Structure 1
Amino acid sequence: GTKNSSGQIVTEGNSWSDYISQIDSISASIILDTENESYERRVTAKNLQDPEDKTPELTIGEAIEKAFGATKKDGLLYFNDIPIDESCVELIFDDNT
């Protein structure tokens, strides 16, 4: 849904399909899995090959702090008073990554 100048919003022809793959070509897919829930986020990246683009890039710890709303507590990262450190969780990568 998107609001026009009339103040209310409309849902007609505004498909989600034609913003799937575009996002899936600019982003990294980061997924969190806790004991009851799971969360899938897409975080934007910066292509280092062609330099005409100016995308503000970051690191993976900052990417986790920016994707979820993560509170920097004393150097550690905390999500709903759950510690997420480089040593306090379990990370999984596929072979290309």
Structure 2
Amino acid sequence: ARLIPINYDQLKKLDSGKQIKLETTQVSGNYGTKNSQGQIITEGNSWSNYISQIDSVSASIILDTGSQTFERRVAAKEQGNPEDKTPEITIGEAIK
């Protein structure tokens, strides 16, 4: 119900070469699971509960074809941990 205001100084800046840029700081959203019945639920299934975790155990790989972009996370073993049983793969295997 409340519009986004700017002040007079900012308006004067816009009345020039100056342009507003948009940056996305975060995105909330849900994933789907099946409940005890056959129904798919996406209500309490918050993606932000996994973002930190996935980023901590993964390597980032991004493919840029010029027009499209594809971003991936591939799990990798923790270096010092003897109890980490994540299989080791090469960069080529991970890309494939």
Please indicate the TM-score interval, normalised by the length of the shorter structure.
0.5 to 0.7
Q: Distance in 1 between the 2:95 and 2:42 partners? A: 32
4+ residue runs over 3 A deviation: none
Q: Which has the higher helix share?
A: 2
Tell me the TM-score normalized by structure 2: 0.64
Residue from 31, 37, 55 that aligns with 1:6 = 37
Q: Give the number of the structure whose alpha-carbon radius of gyration is greater.
A: 2
1:20 match: 51
Q: Which has the higher strand share?
A: 1
Where structure 2 has 5 or more consecutive residues not aligned to the other structure, the ranges are 1-31
Percent identity of equivalent pairs: 75
Higher RCO (CA-CA < 8 Å; seq separation 6+): 2
Which ranges in structure 1 are unaligned for 5 or more consecutive residues?
Answer: 66-97
Q: What's the RMSD between the two structures over aligned residues?
A: 0.9
- Map 1:13-52; keep pairs closer than 5 Å: 13-52=44-83
